Amino acid sequence: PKKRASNGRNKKGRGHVKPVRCVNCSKSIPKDKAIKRMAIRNIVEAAAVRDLSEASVYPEYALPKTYNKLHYCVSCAIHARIVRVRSREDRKNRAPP
Amino acid sequence: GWVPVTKLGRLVKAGKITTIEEIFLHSLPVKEFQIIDTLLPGLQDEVMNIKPVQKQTRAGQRTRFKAVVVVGDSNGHVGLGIKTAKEVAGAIRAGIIIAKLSVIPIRRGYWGTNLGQPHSLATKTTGKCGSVTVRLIPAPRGSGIVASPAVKKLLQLAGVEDVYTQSNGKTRTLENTLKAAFVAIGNTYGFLTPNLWAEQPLPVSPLDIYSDEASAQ
Amino acid sequence: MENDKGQLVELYVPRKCSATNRIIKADDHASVQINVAKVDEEGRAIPGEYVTYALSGYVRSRGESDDSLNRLAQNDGLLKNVWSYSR
Amino acid sequence: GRVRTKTVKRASKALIERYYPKLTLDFQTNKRLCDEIATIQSKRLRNKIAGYTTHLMKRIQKGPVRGISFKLQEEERERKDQYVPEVSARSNGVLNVDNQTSDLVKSLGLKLPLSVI
Amino acid sequence: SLPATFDLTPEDAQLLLAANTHLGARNVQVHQEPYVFNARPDGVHVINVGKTWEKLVLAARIIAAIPNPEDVVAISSRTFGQRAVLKFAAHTGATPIAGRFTPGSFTNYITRSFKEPRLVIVTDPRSDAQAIKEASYVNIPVIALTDLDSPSEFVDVAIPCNNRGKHSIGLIWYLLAREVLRLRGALVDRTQPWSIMPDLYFYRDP
Amino acid sequence: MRAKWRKKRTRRLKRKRRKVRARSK
Amino acid sequence: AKVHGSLARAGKVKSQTPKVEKTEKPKKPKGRAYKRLLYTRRFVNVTLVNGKRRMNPGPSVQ
Amino acid sequence: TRSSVLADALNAINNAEKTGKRQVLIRPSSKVIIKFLQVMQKHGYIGEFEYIDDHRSGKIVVQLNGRLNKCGVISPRFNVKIGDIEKWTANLLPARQFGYVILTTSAGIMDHEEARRKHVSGKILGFVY
Amino acid sequence: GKGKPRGLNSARKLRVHRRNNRWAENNYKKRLLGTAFKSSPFGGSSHAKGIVLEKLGIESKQPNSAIRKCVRVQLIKNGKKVTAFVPNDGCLNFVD
RNA sequence: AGGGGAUCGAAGAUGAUCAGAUACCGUCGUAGUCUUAACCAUAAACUAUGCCGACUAGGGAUCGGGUGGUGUUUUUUUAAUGACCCACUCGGCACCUUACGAGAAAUCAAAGUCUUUGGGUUCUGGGGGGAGUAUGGUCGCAAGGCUGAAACUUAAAGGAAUUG
Ligand SMILES: [Mg+2]
Ligand SMILES: [Mg+2]
Ligand SMILES: [Mg+2]
Ligand SMILES: [Mg+2]
Ligand SMILES: [Mg+2]
Ligand SMILES: [Mg+2]
Ligand SMILES: [Mg+2]
Ligand SMILES: [Mg+2]
Ligand SMILES: [Mg+2]
Ligand SMILES: [Mg+2]
Ligand SMILES: [Mg+2]
Ligand SMILES: [Mg+2]
Ligand SMILES: [Mg+2]
Ligand SMILES: [Mg+2]
Ligand SMILES: [Mg+2]
Ligand SMILES: [Mg+2]
Ligand SMILES: [Mg+2]
Ligand SMILES: [Mg+2]
Ligand SMILES: [Mg+2]
Ligand SMILES: [Mg+2]
């Protein structure tokens, strides 16, 4: 029987959309599916701001950031515990953490 | 000796209500099995089945007995008890209690010429309990209760004389057949025919006439 | 339920809902009987004599137990300008 | 880990509910009381019990405890729950009103002090 | 039926405007719309007092007629309305139900809270649903305090207060009791107010 | 065996048969 | 299957069951006679029971 | 497309009674609707109906009164010989001692009760009980 | 509703369509393909007579075990070679 | 068939892994991947849910259109017009609660208005195998598509849910 009433993830009013490549699995999965995160960080991490904000030129400066929109896939989005097997009802909760 | 914890229980033991219909008419949630024992003695029980069932302990297995009892006079009131426990003997009697608490009324009727004392049902009725659906159909005199031995017996205690049937679904699961047969006869008083079309003005509920008489310690 | 020689058979004659006039079931344990006190000249309520409505399992279950009572209240003269037929 | 079992607590809640003002915050005396007002099979339990119902006490006299109530407190709540001030409603400068709530009274047949918004 | 005295009187009415009973929710709900008077600017709802009053009267009357005044279970799990239902219990007989309902009250004998009443009053159909739902298992009429967004299910005669808070929940309970005393019992002269305060019915904590 | 491959099988049979037969026109 | 099995032991048992002659006894009544012999028995006098009334036991309980 | 108009109407009527409602709006007022509504109203299964003039085809507001279990149509409007009228009533009426199947005979739209009296038979329309 | 045609004129379809769908009915189909006559080792006939060829020790299926006794038969009318089961104990010596 | 052939990459080749490893992983690479003209007609071509017509219950977002609002925000002075707000209301993509009702259940605003069995209408199924097989026919350059048996065989095959 049907596990998910949305089947995969949102279709409804399309029937097909272009797929992408699982950022780590190197797989392939339609854009409508596929777990997604927006990986922003600092160039020089946290511990290093000391040596960095000190041993430079420029007043204080302004730390740069990286912008990587990850596309995972149920295979490697589970393995990397990006998501996980929530209980029967728990599954319904579309609510973001 | 019987000690009524219920309000309806008191007024019955205390002779303030003496008839069964007095409870149906006012639609009163019966809780004590002693009530219907008093209001309705000369009752009869027929034990329908004893079909043991099984499962698990947190390792191996669980295994008990399942009993089916119908109770009835032969006159308009009938009930169904399904109970399963650790003993045959006790889960039987256990049901005769749950049977009685379930006693329901019948609008028995005529197939045609209303010549003295109904011989059938009001109208066509029908019950369901998953898959099985039994249908009850009025009948001429001399005919009989045309049904499967189970249903018939339930329709015997129901006190029916002549009725036709048309059961559909897995008639073989005894428990589910009987329940819907019950569900059927318990629906006769459900049908608003033009006999009952008139207007009466609503009795006041004996839970308020002898209200002073009833209430708690 | 008459018969041959007009005798009254049929072991019991069901009440009837007042918001639909549909038979009040023998096991309709969501059906109910409201009893409204009839007053006398100024204030004093009267034991014994009350105004009485009777609502059904179905009507009540679907939330229509307020509108239907009010409808029935104004009507038998228990209320004034609370429920308004036309809407 | 020291977790007093139910059989202890179920009796501490039981001695307080019965014999309250005959008890006190002390351990030693309460221990003696149990020999009179109760019956306990073992000496160690007796104390184990005594030592809990005496724990409750020291916070009973600090603020009531959830499942537990006795006589001398039950009217002490009836005392506090009878306060009634000068009044509130009252009216401190007519009846301050909003819009259409005025139209509500305007079309109701009532006098009433007024105010707009 | 009911004479000219039972008319509303802006003596009373003022307490209702003062207690802010006339202030309703921003979700009208299909069944409560008869009680709507009209809508405020900047999203509020104005309820109709003459209806709340008239209801209350009928409520008050239905409270009466009931013979033994002690099997009339008046419930609030809700904080605000809890203190009130203790007081309503004081005045008219009425076994109250403060705080937890303990599922298995009306159905299931054996329990030590087997109130088997013949009327239930409720303060808030939401937070007291288990109270309502269970009452509808065993043939029991139900008086209830509604707002505008309220569970109309298995409640008869609804009294549209505010129940959101302030003193509406007390006042309506106060007046409720006040009127079931002016109804039969011992108050008489339904024209004269009461030595009893309104703030006798409110909250606490502090 | 997998419905997909059991098809491939029955397709393989059919051609060999198509061939064994036309070994006599 | 295997279709040639051993025809050798064609009729073992019935060819080696102890002969025992069927004992003589008085002939039973025939016709209406018989069906009377049932009625007057099977429920007129009744015999041994159990709580359900049995039919053909032997050693019984005891 | 709309195909029965009558059945469309009795549907609404039926659906209305079930859901506890005691009034229906109907589209679109046909004459067959009316007589049907009449023969119903006679035996008591409905209140009074009030036709509405749109400059179109019509509307009807019927007053309901509990006591209606099922009205309903039997499409296709079958032929009925006169000795077969019993075969229907037997088939689709709850009991011998009441309920109504209504026809359409060349005499007019009547119930099977009346049709029996005039000794006419036609083509079946529907039922009431 | 109901998915079939309801009309007063669809009697054409209504009857023809069952004549179609009758063909999934096994016995109807056997009766109308005359399999009875053609395929069966009898004629269709109730009984049939033939001569004995050999005797077989047909071993029983699972989960039993024995050697069911059987003869091979040359059907007279048919020429059809068919094996039959000899029933009851040691009857297989009544036949040669 | 011609063009194009960056990429990735069936075949194949190679390096490892393994008892074996024709695989998975690594590298190399044909066809292919793009296109143009022709073919092919099939996918879990999915909502595993025919189409039109009516009816039965609430809640809120959002898309398109329209409507009403001595609304908000816009010029250098507050009118236009732009967006934005609120209410309405058609026609959408969906969601939420609910469950009167239905269902074997899972569940369903239809999968409801069905033993109180009929609005119109197309299509398909009738235990499991044998088998999408054989045979004829037909369309295709081909691969194949469409059409489609029986002999014989078998008591289960199968669904949803529950407990281990
Ligand atoms: Mg697709
Ligand atoms: Mg896709
Ligand atoms: Mg079915
Ligand atoms: Mg296999
Ligand atoms: Mg292939
Ligand atoms: Mg051979
Ligand atoms: Mg290779
Ligand atoms: Mg290995
Ligand atoms: Mg290979
Ligand atoms: Mg070509
Ligand atoms: Mg296909
Ligand atoms: Mg539609
Ligand atoms: Mg459910
Ligand atoms: Mg039904
Ligand atoms: Mg078949
Ligand atoms: Mg191929
Ligand atoms: Mg077997
Ligand atoms: Mg499958
Ligand atoms: Mg399964
Ligand atoms: Mg499991």
Of the candidates E194, E206, E15, the residue with the CA atom closest to the CA atom of residue E87: E194
CA of A76 from ligand 8 middle (Å) equals 26
- Looking at all shown ligands, the one closest to residue A11's CA atom is 2
**Alpha-carbon distance D60 to D67, whole Å?**
12
Of the candidates H72, H66, H70, the residue with the CA atom closest to the CA atom of residue H6: H72
Of the candidates B77, B20, B80, the residue with the CA atom closest to the CA atom of residue B46: B80
What is the DSSP pairing of strand E142-146 with strand E120-122?
parallel
**Alpha-carbon distance B119 to I74, whole Å?**
66
Which tokens in the block code for residue B103?
Answer: 């006693």
**Alpha-carbon distance E32 to E52, whole Å?**
12
Can you give the distance from the CA of residue A44 to the C1' of nucleotide J13 in angstroms?
Answer: 46
Residue with tokens 């035996």: H43
Question: Is I8 an interface residue toward H (CB < 8 Å)?
Answer: yes
Resolution, in Å, please?
Answer: 3.5
In DSSP terms, B138 is beta-bridged to B163
**Alpha-carbon distance I93 to G15, whole Å?**
12
Side-chain-facing half-sphere of G62: CA atoms under 13 Å? 0
Structure letter (DSSP) for residue G45: I
Contacts of H94 (CB under 8 A, 6+ apart): B123, B124, B191, B193, H69, H129
> Which of C13, C20, C51 should be substituted to probe chain B, the one whose Cβ sees the most B Cβ atoms within 10 Å?
C13
> E139–C37: do the CB atoms touch at under 8 Å?
no
Amino acid identity at B74: S
| A19 within 8 A of A30, measured Cβ to Cβ | yes
Distance from CA of I17 to the nearest CA of H (A): 19
Q: CB F14: neighbour CB atoms within 10 A? A: 10
Contacts of F1 (CB under 8 A, 6+ apart): F9
CB nearest to C64's CB, from H20, H65, H67: H20
Number of H helices, E strands in chain A: 2, 4
Handedness of CA D87, D89, D91, D93 (dihedral sign): positive
Which tokens in the block code for residue E96?
Answer: 């109250």
**Alpha-carbon distance B90 to E177, whole Å?**
51
Of the candidates C65, C35, D112, the residue with the CA atom closest to the CA atom of residue E49: D112
**Alpha-carbon distance G3 to D110, whole Å?**
110
Shortest CA to C1' contact from E30: nucleotide: J58
Chosen CATH of D6-61 out of 3.30.300.30, 1.10.60.20, 1.10.1060.10, 3.40.640.10: 1.10.60.20
Question: Is H83 an interface residue toward I (CB < 8 Å)?
Answer: no
Q: CB H51: neighbour CB atoms within 10 A? A: 13
Question: Is C86 an interface residue toward E (CB < 8 Å)?
Answer: no
**Alpha-carbon distance E165 to B15, whole Å?**
49
Ramachandran category for residue H125: left, alpha or beta (phi over 0 → left; psi -120 to 50 → alpha): alpha
The dihedrals phi and psi of A52, each to the nearest 5 degrees, come to -85, -55
Contacts of D4 (CB under 8 A, 6+ apart): D48, D52
Of the candidates E138, C27, C31, C32, the residue with the CA atom closest to the CA atom of residue B104: C27
Q: CB D97: neighbour CB atoms within 10 A? A: 18
Which approach determined this entry?
Answer: X-ray
**Alpha-carbon distance E37 to E46, whole Å?**
6
Can you give the distance from the CA of residue I22 to the C1' of nucleotide J42 in angstroms?
Answer: 31
Which tokens in the block code for residue C80?
Answer: 């004034």
Residues before each break in chain F (C–N > 2.5 Å)? none
- Looking at all shown ligands, the one closest to residue A30's CA atom is 2
Can you give the distance from the CA of residue F6 to the C1' of nucleotide J46 in angstroms?
Answer: 24
**Alpha-carbon distance I93 to E61, whole Å?**
102
**Alpha-carbon distance C12 to B203, whole Å?**
13
Instruction: Give the residue whose CA sits closest to J151 at C1'.
Output: I39
The dihedrals phi and psi of G26, each to the nearest 5 degrees, come to -55, 130
Domain that holds residue I30: 1-96
Nucleotides on chain J within 7 angstroms of protein Cβ: 46-48, 50, 52-60, 93-97, 100, 103-108, 112-127, 131-135, 143-144, 150-152, 154-155, 159-161, 163-164
Specify the CATH number for the domain of residue C37.
3.30.1230.20
Domain that holds residue C14: 1-87
- Whether there are 3 or more C-beta pairs closer than 8 Å between F and I is no
Question: Is E111 an interface residue toward B (CB < 8 Å)?
Answer: no
Residue H5 burial by CB count (10 A; 0-12/13-18/19+): exposed, middle or buried? middle
Q: At CA F23, angle to CA F17 and CA F25, rounded to 5?
A: 105
Can you give the distance from the CA of residue E39 to the C1' of nucleotide J69 in angstroms?
Answer: 15
